[PDB]
RNA sequence: UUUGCUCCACACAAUAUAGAUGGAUACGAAUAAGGCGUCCUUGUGGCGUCGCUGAACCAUAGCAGGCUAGCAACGGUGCACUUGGCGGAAAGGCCUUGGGUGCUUGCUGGCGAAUUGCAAUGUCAUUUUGCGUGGGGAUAAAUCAUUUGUAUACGACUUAGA
RNA sequence: GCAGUCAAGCGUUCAUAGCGACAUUGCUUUUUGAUUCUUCGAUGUCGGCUCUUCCUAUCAUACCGAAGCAGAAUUCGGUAA
RNA sequence: AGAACUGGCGAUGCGGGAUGAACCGAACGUAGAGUUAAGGUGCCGGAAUACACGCUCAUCAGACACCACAAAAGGUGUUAGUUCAUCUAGACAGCCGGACGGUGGCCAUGGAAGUCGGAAUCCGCUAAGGAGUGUGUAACAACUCACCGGCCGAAUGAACUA
RNA sequence: GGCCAGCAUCAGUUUUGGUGGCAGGAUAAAUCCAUAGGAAUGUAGCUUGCCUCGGUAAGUAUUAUAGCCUGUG
């Protein structure tokens, strides 16, 4: 249809002040500074009042509006990030062996080393991206915590922990060990 | 089939002894030439009334050139085309300065999106909807908001020369 | 209008930028082409390697030395398109190819002298915005050519001077700029105005 | 502290915008955008030039940085009223893109005992612009 | 080497020309953005300005550009010297110091041009080679034959021999 | 010969895990025909042996998805020559 | 493989369909100039990287008749339409709150408690509430949905066509 | 006299520009002018509501401190 005009609105919070050159955005807030290259989507950014920003699609069509929420919804993203941090909480399910994780380093990499996955001797290890912090919740029972700013570096974390515990050459309705990613909210509390 | 203009022809069904002043029928037709008017004439004809060309006699052909041709208009055009496997009616509707313009556009965006050739479609009526809030297709009202205004981003100029020593800006 | 038109190839859409030189050259212009590693192809990257790949495929199944030879480099593909977009069997042909020089980077012969864009070739220019396109450097090195990082090294090597020379061009530039714009109310520059000058 | 954001500010497509017809009967004369009927079309009047009232294509003008108030759908008369009283042929003649199609012009009028002339000056400047350059 | 070889300079003979006829005139990056100028609190900063093509910029007057006389200014430019630095991607080029010499159309004079007959590319470039005149420089190898067998159909290979 | 679509039914209940009637759309040229265009001043007529290469409609091996996958075994399917 | 009519090839070059007896165009003495046919005009290659409105992104894209193939069936890919509906008297989505009394209704089910269950979908209060929409439990206790409200602000849903 | 050309004025064929006078149509339609009537993507004004300059929102209001549309001439 090539709609004229689509825009979508990006609320600053106070503490946070947001830099956005040519399509490359940098957030900075309490918690620390992200950074994202949107060179690949073609969106026009605009400031209003320093608590609100505007990006909009000219003459866009179907696929090139459904870009620009996607844009607005990363920006989003990173203000959360910056300001409320993001968490995703792990639990270790487990029908007869215990899953042994723990944090080690090779080189000083930090990684998050997981044991006795199914009785494996086998070591899976799996790197944690920098700006990810690794904190295993005392008063919960096998859960291990990631944190950071980057949601998607928390959440590609996560996700990395729980794709390297995937289940071979079983039936995985029965067979459901592995570490599951049961939360994904902020680290600031009630906000 | 070319750049439209619009005529009116009136033809008879020629007079006998039997009915003298026959009745007088009239259409609107768009076309590149008179020639051409008249052909399209004497086929909706045919497909109306029980007449044909040998039969009948052209009385009158005129140009009817738009009354405001410089004023904006929102058009609602409908049609009935032929495609690969059956016939439909559409309602369209085409921004445009006059009545010949918005055909043209017609059978052009017809032609893109439908694959439907001059020789399939037929213009059942071509209207002025003189109140917006009537225009009911989102292509069209997109344009009549107050204070329309956008702009034309990537700009790209035509070089002149095979090679140039700038390497260019797309700004506009 | 150059005895020797060096043409910068960096996002050039190799196709046309093949089909402009080709032109140029067997009208009897020299070519050299600068930057093949920087050269656009319209399409996602995934697809031009397919379409390497069946390249690649293609051999003489008696003699592989005898097929068609597949050259990885990114001055060798913007070759292959010239090639077959120039009559190359013919005297001719042979005379307008050796009209003709591709490089990746610059070397040392150019890196000093005016390098021209062709704008009926540029991707900015031609190609509608969002559609996905490679780059030639990254397609070689995917099919086996093995001097991206020699390449890549000696232009970041070769802008660092350059970026020198056009600092100290650009101090020289502003001082006749301010010798220009002085004397700009002189008799002799009003009249040069009056004239158009 | 303050979020920066580049403006990027284009020319709009908008009615009292003014165009500079590039190729037609008009050719490098002033027009009005009078209202928009698509993305790519537009009803534009240039009453001052000489522009006849006519829908054209935008890929036909090039937008210039004038614009004026007008309200939509003026008359070729509104057109040129507004257009007087904005002085938009003044805005447009002292801007640098006008005195570079007027300068080119006047160097295409050139005749061949004004170009020997303007070698002369040339030369005669060029000594003068030297010379400082070495004392500077 | 019945005076051989190489380099430079000059002259003379050839030899051709994928095609000179003022100058290939150097940021990088982006393009839903940049360039330049300027300011500061030096940044993804403020302000100003430009583009809308090189239709530019530089150069460009003088028997294909002669011979002369001045003015003005210490500029521009050519040459051969020369100071130092940078350049290895195919550097073989870029920049810089100093003096010397010529030209200077920045300005103002004096003389010359004709008859190539009303045009005729009307010959002005650079590519190789040879020769002669001077100056400078250096003073071997390879193959055959013989020999080895780490080689081998023959060639080839790999060894040895004043 | 191989592969689709529909889905009445089978599959304890459940059309589609796996199947699948009545129909119907195709692909292939490793079947056999049909034809008689080339060859009758001659293209050496079975099979095997030997050897190379190619195809994939994959038997195995690699990695996977599904199941009427608890395990084991197996079945269906994908990328794959 | 066999007939009808015509036009062709055979017997025919020429321009076009890359190529080809038959197709398209056009039929032919030797030349010059002009204009065209069919077919083309990014480059090969003569001729607009012409102008204009749209459509298409293909991890097997498509790209001119004869002709050198692809079908049924499918796809919130994307585009344009047809018809029927909901909707500022607030449409769909999400979030939040409730979601009854009689009544754990009757019948029974081993155990059913609005819901393994069987008939009626009972009345009242109703904005709404179905003897309930489902889940859960041996049953429960309990949730949950339809449903109704609050927010939200203008569009939304379905079946079809190509 | 032979060879190769240059220009001018013509003739035959043709190609490519500049410019003049007419004809027709709805004796183009428009624009423009005049007039009548309208509503809006509602201009001035006016009322209610905010408050950061002083502007904005909702109504009313058909030319006013912009304009536009239609008919007619
Ligand atoms: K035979
Ligand atoms: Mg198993
Ligand atoms: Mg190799
Ligand atoms: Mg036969
Ligand atoms: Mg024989
Ligand atoms: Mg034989
Ligand atoms: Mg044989
Ligand atoms: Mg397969
Ligand atoms: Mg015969
Ligand atoms: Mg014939
Ligand atoms: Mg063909
Ligand atoms: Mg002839
Ligand atoms: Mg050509
Ligand atoms: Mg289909
Ligand atoms: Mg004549």
Redesign the pocket.
Same mark, same amino acid.
């Not at chain 4, 309200?71 to 509104?78: I, S």
């Given at each position: 249809?090539?709609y004229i005009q689509t825009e979508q609105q990006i609320e600053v919070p106070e503490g946070v002040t947001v =830099?956005?050159?040519? *399509?490359?955005?940098?957030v900075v807030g309490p918690r620390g500074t992200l950074?994202k290259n949107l060179?690949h %989507?073609?969106?026009?950014?605009t400031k209003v009042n320093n608590q609100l920003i505007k990006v !909009?699609?000219?003459?866009?069509?179907?696929? +090139?509006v459904?870009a620009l929420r996607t844009v607005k919804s990363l920006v989003d993203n990173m203000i959360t990030g910056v300001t409320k941090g993001y968490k995703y909480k792990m639990r270790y399910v487990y029908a007869h062996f215990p899953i042994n994780v723990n944090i080690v380093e090779k080189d000083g990499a930090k990684f998050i080393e997981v044991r006795n996955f199914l009785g494996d001797k086998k070591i899976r290890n799996v790197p944690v991206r920098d700006g990810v912090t690794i904190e295993f919740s005392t008063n919960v029972k096998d859960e291990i915590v990631l944190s950071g700013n980057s949601v998607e570096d928390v959440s590609q974390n996560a996700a990395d922990l729980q794709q390297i515990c995937?289940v071979?050459?079983?039936?995985?309705?029965?067979?459901l060990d592995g570490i599951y990613v049961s939360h994904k909210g902020f680290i600031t509390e009630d906000l | 089939m070319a750049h439209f203009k619009e005529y009116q022809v009136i033809g008879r069904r020629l007079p006998t002894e039997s009915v003298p002043e026959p009745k007088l029928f009239r259409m609107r037709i768009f076309a590149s030439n008179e020639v051409i008017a008249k052909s399209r004439y004497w086929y909706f004809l045919q497909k109306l009334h029980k007449v044909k060309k040998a039969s009948g006699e052209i009385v009158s052909i005129? &140009? %009817?050139?738009? @009354? +405001? #041709?410089?004023?904006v208009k929102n058009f609602g055009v409908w049609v009935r085309y032929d495609?690969?496997?059956?016939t +439909?009616?559409?309602?369209?509707?085409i921004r445009d300065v006059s009545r010949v313009a918005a055909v043209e556009?017609l059978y052009?965006?017809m032609?893109?999106?439908?694959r439907a050739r001059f020789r399939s479609i037929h213009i059942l009526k071509v209207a002025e909807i003189?109140?917006?809030?009537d225009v009911k297709?989102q292509?069209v009202k997109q344009?009549?908001?107050?204070?329309?205004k956008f702009p034309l981003? +990537?700009?790209v &100029?035509?070089?002149?020369?095979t090679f =140039?020593?700038? *390497?260019?800006?797309?700004?506009? | 209008?150059? #005895?020797?038109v060096?043409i910068?190839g960096?996002?050039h859409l190799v196709?046309?930028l !093949? $089909?402009?030189v080709?032109?140029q050259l067997?009208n009897?212009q020299?070519i050299?082409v600068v930057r093949a590693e920087?050269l656009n192809i319209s399409?996602?990257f995934?697809?031009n390697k397919?379409k390497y790949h069946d390249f690649l495929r293609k051999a003489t199944?008696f003699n592989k030395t005898r097929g068609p030879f597949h050259f990885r480099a990114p001055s060798r593909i913007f070759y292959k398109a010239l090639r077959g977009?120039? =009559?190359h069997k013919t @005297?001719?042909?042979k005379?307008a190819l050796?009209?003709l020089k591709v490089?990746?980077? %610059?070397?040392?012969?150019?890196?000093?002298?005016?390098?021209v864009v062709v704008?009926?070739?540029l991707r900015?220019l031609r190609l /509608?915005?969002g *559609?996905?396109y490679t780059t030639l450097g990254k397609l070689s090195t995917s099919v086996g050519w093995k001097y991206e990082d020699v390449?890549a090294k000696?232009?970041a /090597?070769?802008?660092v $001077?350059? @970026?020198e020379?056009?600092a100290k061009? *650009?101090?020289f530039?502003?001082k006749v700029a301010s010798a220009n714009a002085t004397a700009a109310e002189s008799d002799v520059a009003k009249q040069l105005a009056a004239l158009g000058? | 502290t303050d979020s920066?954001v580049?403006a990027?500010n284009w020319r709009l497509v908008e009615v009292g915008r003014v165009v500079?017809i590039?190729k037609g009967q008009s050719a490098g004369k002033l027009a009005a955008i009078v209202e928009i009927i698509?993305?790519?079309?537009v009803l534009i009047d240039g009453?001052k030039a000489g522009v #006849?009232?006519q829908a054209i294509?935008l890929? &036909?003008v090039?937008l210039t940085?004038l614009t004026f108030?007008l309200?939509?759908?003026?008359?070729?008369?509104?057109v040129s009223?507004?257009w007087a009283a904005a002085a938009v042929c003044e805005k447009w003649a002292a =801007?640098?893109?006008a005195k /570079?199609i007027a300068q080119?012009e006047r160097? !295409?009028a050139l005749t061949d005992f004004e170009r020997?002339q303007?070698?002369?000056l040339?030369? &005669?400047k060029?000594?003068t612009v030297?010379?400082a350059?070495?004392?500077a």
């Open positions: 249809m090539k =830099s956005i050159k040519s *399509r490359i955005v940098k950074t060179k %989507i073609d969106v026009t950014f !909009a699609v000219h003459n866009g069509g179907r696929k +090139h459904a995937r071979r050459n079983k039936d995985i309705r029965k067979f | 005129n &140009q %009817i050139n738009e @009354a +405001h #041709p410089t004023k495609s690969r496997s059956g +439909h009616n559409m309602y369209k509707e556009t052009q965006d032609a893109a999106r439908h003189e109140k917006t809030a297709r292509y344009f009549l908001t107050k204070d329309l981003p +990537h700009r &100029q035509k070089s002149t020369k =140039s020593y700038k *390497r260019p800006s797309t700004f506009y | 209008v150059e #005895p020797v060096v910068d960096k996002g196709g046309r !093949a $089909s402009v080709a032109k067997l009897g020299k050299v920087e399409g996602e995934f697809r397919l199944a977009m120039v =009559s @005297a001719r042909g005379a050796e009209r490089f990746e980077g %610059i070397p040392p012969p150019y890196d000093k002298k005016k390098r704008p009926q070739a900015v /509608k915005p *559609r996905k390449v000696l232009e /090597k070769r802008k $001077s350059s @970026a020379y056009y061009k *650009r101090a530039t502003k000058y | 920066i580049k990027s500079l590039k698509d993305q790519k079309k009453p #006849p009232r294509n890929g &036909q090039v940085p108030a309200p939509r759908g003026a008359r070729t008369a509104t009223k507004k =801007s640098s893109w /570079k080119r160097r !295409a020997f303007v070698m002369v040339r030369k &005669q060029r000594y030297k010379k350059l070495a004392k």
